[PDB]
PDB file of C-alpha atoms in Angstrom:
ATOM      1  CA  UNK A   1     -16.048 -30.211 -12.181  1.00 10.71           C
ATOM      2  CA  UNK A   2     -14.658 -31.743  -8.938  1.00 11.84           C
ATOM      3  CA  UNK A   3     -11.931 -32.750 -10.681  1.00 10.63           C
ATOM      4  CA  UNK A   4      -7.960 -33.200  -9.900  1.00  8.10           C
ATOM      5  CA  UNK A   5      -8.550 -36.487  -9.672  1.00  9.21           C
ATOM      6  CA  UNK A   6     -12.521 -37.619  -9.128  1.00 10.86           C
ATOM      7  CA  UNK A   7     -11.341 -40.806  -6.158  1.00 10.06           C
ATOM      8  CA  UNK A   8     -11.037 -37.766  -4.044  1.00 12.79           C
ATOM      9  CA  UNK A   9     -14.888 -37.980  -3.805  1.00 13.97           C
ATOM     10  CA  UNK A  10     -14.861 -35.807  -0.516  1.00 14.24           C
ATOM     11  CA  UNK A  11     -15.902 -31.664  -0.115  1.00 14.50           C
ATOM     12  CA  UNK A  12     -16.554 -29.701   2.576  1.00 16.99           C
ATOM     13  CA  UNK A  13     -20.669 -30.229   3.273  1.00 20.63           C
ATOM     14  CA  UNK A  14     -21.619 -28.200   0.591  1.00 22.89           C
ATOM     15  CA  UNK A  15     -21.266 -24.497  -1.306  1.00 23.94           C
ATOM     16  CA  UNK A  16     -19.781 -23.592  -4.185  1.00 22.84           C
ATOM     17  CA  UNK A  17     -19.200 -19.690  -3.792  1.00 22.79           C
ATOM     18  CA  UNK A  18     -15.961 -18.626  -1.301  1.00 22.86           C
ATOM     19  CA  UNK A  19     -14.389 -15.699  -3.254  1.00 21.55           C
ATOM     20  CA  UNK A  20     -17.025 -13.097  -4.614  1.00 21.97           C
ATOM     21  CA  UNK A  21     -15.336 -10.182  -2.696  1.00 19.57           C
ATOM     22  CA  UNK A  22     -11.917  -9.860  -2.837  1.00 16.84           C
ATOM     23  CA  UNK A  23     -10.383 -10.674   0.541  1.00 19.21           C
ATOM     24  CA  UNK A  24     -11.151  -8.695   3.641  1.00 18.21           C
ATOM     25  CA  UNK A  25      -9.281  -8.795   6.530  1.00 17.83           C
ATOM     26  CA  UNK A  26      -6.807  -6.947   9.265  1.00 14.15           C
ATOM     27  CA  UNK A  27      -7.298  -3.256   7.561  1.00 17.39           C
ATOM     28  CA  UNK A  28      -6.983   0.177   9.292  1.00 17.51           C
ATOM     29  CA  UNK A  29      -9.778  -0.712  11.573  1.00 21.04           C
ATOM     30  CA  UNK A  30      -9.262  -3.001  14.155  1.00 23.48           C
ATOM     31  CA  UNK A  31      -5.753  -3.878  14.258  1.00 24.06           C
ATOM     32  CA  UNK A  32      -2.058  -3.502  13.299  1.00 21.93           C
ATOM     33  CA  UNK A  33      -2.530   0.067  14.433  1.00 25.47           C
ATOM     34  CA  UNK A  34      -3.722  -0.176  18.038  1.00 23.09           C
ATOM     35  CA  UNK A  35      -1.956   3.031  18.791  1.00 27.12           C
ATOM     36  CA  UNK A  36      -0.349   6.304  17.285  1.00 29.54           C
ATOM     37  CA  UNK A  37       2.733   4.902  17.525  1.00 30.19           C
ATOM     38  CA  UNK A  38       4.887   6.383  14.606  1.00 29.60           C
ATOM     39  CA  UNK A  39       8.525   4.548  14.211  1.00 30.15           C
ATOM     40  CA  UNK A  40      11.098   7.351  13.343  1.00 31.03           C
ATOM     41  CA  UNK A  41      13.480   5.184  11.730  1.00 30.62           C
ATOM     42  CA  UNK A  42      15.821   5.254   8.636  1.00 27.94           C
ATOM     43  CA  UNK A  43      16.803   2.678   6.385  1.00 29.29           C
ATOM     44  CA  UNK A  44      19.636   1.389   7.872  1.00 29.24           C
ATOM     45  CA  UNK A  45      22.716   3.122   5.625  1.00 32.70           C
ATOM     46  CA  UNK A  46      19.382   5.347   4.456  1.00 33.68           C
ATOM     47  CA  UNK A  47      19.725   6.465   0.743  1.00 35.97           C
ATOM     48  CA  UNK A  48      16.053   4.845   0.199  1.00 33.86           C
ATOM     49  CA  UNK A  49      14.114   6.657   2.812  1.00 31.92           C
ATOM     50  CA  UNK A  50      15.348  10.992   1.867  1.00 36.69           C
ATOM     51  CA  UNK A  51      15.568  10.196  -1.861  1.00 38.73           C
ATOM     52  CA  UNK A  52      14.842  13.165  -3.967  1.00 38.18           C
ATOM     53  CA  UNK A  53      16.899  11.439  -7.195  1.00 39.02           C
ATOM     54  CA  UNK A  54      14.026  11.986  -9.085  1.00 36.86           C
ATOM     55  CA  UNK A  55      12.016   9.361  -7.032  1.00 38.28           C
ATOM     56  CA  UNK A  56       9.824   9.178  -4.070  1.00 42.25           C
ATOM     57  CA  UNK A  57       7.874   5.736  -2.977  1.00 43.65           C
ATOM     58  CA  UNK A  58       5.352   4.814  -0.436  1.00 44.38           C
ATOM     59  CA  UNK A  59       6.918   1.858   1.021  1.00 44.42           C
ATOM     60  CA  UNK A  60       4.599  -0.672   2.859  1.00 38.63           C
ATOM     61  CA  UNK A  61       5.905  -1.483   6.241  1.00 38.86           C
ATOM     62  CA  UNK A  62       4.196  -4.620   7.541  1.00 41.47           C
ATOM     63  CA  UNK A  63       0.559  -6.062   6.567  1.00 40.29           C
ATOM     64  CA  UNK A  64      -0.263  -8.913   5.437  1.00 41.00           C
ATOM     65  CA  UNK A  65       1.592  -8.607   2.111  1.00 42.93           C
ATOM     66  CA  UNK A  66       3.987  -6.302   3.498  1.00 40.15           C
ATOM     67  CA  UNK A  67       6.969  -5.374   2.363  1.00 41.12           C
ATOM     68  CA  UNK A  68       6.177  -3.421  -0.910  1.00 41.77           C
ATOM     69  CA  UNK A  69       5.906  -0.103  -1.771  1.00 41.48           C
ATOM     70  CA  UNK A  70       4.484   2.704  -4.875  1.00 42.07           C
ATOM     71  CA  UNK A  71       7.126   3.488  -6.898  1.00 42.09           C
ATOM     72  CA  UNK A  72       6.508   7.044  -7.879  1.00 39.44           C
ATOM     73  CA  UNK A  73       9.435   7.151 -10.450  1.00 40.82           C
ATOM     74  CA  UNK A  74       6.809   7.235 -12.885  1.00 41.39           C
ATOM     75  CA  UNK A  75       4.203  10.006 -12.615  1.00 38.96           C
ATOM     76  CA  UNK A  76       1.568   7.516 -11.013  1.00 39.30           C
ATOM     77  CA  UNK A  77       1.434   4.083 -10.279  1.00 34.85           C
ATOM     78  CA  UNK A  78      -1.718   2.156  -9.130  1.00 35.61           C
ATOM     79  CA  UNK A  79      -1.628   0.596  -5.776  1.00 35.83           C
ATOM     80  CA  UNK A  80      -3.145  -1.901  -4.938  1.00 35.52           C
ATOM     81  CA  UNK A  81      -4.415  -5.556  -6.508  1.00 35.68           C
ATOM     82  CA  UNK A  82      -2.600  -5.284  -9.729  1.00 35.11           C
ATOM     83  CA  UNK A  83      -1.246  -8.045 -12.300  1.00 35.23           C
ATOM     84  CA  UNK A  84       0.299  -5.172 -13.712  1.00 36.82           C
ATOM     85  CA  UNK A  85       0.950  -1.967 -12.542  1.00 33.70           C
ATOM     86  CA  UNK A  86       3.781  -1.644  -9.663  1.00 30.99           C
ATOM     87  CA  UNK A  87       2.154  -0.981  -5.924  1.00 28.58           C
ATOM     88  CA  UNK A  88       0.381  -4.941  -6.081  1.00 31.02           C
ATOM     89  CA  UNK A  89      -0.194  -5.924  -2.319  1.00 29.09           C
ATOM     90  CA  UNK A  90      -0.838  -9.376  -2.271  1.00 30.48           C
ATOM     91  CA  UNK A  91      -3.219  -8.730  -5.303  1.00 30.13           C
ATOM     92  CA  UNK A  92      -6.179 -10.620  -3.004  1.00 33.50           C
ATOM     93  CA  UNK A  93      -6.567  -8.008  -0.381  1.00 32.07           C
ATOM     94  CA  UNK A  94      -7.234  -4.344  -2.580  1.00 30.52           C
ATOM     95  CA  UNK A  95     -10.310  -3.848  -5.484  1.00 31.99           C
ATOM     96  CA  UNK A  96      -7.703  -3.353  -7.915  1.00 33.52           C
ATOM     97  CA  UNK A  97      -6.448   0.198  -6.451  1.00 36.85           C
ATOM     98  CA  UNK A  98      -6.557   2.303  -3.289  1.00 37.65           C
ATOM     99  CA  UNK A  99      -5.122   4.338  -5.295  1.00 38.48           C
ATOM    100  CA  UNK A 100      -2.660   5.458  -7.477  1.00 39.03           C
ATOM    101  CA  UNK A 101       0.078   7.392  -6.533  1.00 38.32           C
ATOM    102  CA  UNK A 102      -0.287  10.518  -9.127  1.00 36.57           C
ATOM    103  CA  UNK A 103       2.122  13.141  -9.298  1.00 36.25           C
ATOM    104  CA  UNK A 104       0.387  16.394 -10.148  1.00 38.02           C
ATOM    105  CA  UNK A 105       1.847  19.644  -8.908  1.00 40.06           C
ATOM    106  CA  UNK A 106       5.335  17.893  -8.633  1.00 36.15           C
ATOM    107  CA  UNK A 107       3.752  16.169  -5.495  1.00 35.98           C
ATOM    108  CA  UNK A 108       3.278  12.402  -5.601  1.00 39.01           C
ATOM    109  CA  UNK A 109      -0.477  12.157  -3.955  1.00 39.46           C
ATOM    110  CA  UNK A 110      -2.992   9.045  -2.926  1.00 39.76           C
ATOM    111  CA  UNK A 111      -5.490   9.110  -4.605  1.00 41.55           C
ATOM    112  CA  UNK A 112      -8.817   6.863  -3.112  1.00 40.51           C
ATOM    113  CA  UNK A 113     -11.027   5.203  -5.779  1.00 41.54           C
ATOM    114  CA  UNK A 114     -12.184   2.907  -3.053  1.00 38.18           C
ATOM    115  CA  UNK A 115     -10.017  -0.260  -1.795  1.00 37.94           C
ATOM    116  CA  UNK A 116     -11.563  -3.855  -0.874  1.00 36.03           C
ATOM    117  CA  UNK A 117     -10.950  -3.693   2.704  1.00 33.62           C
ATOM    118  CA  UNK A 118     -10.879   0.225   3.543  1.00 35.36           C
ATOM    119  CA  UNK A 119      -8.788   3.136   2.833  1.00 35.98           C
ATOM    120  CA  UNK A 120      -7.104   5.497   5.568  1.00 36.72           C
ATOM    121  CA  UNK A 121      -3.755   7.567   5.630  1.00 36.21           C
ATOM    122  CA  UNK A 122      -3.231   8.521   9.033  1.00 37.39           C
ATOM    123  CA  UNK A 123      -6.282   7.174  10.398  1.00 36.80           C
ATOM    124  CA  UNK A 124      -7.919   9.259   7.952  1.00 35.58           C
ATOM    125  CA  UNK A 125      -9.639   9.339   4.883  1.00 36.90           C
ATOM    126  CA  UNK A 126      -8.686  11.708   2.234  1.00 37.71           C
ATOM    127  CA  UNK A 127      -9.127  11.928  -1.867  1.00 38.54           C
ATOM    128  CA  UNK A 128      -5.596  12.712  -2.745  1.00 37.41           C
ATOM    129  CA  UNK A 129      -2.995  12.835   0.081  1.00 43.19           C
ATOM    130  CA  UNK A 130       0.559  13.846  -0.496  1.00 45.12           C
ATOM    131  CA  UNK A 131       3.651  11.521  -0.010  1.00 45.91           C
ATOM    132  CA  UNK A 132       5.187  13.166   2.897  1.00 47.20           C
ATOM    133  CA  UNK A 133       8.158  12.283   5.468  1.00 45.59           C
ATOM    134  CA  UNK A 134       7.527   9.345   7.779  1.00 41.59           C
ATOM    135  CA  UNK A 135       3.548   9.249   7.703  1.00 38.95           C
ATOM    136  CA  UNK A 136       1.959   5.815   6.316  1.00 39.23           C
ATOM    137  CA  UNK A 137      -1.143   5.224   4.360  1.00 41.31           C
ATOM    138  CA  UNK A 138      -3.678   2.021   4.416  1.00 42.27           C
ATOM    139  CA  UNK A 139      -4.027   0.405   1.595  1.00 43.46           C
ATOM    140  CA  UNK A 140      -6.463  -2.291   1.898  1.00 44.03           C
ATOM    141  CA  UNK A 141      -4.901  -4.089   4.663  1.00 44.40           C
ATOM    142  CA  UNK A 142      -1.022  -2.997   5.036  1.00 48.20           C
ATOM    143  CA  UNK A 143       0.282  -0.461   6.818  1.00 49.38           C
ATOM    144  CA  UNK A 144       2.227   1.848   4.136  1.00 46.13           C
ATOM    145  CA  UNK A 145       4.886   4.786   4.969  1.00 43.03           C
ATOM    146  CA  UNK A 146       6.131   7.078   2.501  1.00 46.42           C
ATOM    147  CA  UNK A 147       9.543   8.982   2.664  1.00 48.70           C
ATOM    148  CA  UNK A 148      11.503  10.810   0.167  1.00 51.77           C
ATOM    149  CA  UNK A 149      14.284  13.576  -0.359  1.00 50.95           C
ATOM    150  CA  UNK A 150      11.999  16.693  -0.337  1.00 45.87           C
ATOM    151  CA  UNK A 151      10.901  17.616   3.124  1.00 42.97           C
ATOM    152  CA  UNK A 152      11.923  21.648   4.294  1.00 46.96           C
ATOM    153  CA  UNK A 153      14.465  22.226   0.855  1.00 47.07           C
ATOM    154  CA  UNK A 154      17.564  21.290   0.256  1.00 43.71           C
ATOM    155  CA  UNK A 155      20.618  23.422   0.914  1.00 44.86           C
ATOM    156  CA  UNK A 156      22.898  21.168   0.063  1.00 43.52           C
ATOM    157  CA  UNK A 157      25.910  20.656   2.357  1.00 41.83           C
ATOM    158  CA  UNK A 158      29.581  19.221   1.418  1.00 44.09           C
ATOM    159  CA  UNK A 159      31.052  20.590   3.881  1.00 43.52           C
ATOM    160  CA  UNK A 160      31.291  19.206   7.211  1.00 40.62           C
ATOM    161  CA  UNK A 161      34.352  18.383   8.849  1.00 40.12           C
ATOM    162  CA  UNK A 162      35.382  18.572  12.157  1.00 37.48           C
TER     163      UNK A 162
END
């Protein structure tokens, strides 16, 4: 103990314990949110945001990990602090899951088993909310939207020229 190398003989004041909660901070509480402001955007080329190959995902738009998403390619995927799962968000932030994405009923759902720094999905809580079109969920502290090919059907359409 206070090692890496003992010349540093300098700590704070005093205290030992920092991390016995996982880390709390920014979730769907205070901030990030503000306002029901929902972004009706595609992915750029889109292909990743009306996918119905089989695959839908959650997809976390920004907090603090940001960037990540549930891949629901597999029937359900824990989301959340995970060494090893698929939906990890920082892996600080979330008690191991918010939830985990199951797919019962051919509907990929949220399930809440109670996340480190709150769970909502559309400033809501719910048990087991279904991956929809353009709605986000809060995971711990990120701000995550799911899309995905299934929405009203689909007719399918080749034809279409002008």
């Amino acid at each position: 103990v206070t090692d890496m190398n003992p010349d540093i003989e300098k700590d704070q004041t005093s205290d030992e314990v920092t991390v016995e909660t996982t880390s709390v901070f920014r979730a769907d509480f205070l901030s990030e949110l503000d306002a029901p402001a929902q972004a009706g955007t595609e992915s750029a080329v889109s292909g990743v945001e009306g996918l119905p190959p089989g695959s839908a995902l959650l997809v976390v738009k920004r907090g603090p990990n940001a960037g990540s998403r549930f891949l629901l390619d597999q029937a359900i995927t824990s989301a959340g602090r995970h060494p090893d799962s698929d939906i990890f968000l920082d892996d600080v932030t979330v008690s191991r899951r918010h939830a985990e994405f199951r797919l019962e009923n051919n509907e990929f759902n949220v399930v809440d088993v109670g996340s480190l720094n709150g769970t909502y999905v559309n400033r809501e809580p719910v048990d087991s909310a279904v991956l929809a079109n353009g709605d986000e969920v809060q995971i711990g502290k990120f701000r995550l939207v799911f899309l995905t090919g299934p929405k009203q059907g689909e007719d399918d359409g080749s034809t279409g020229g002008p």
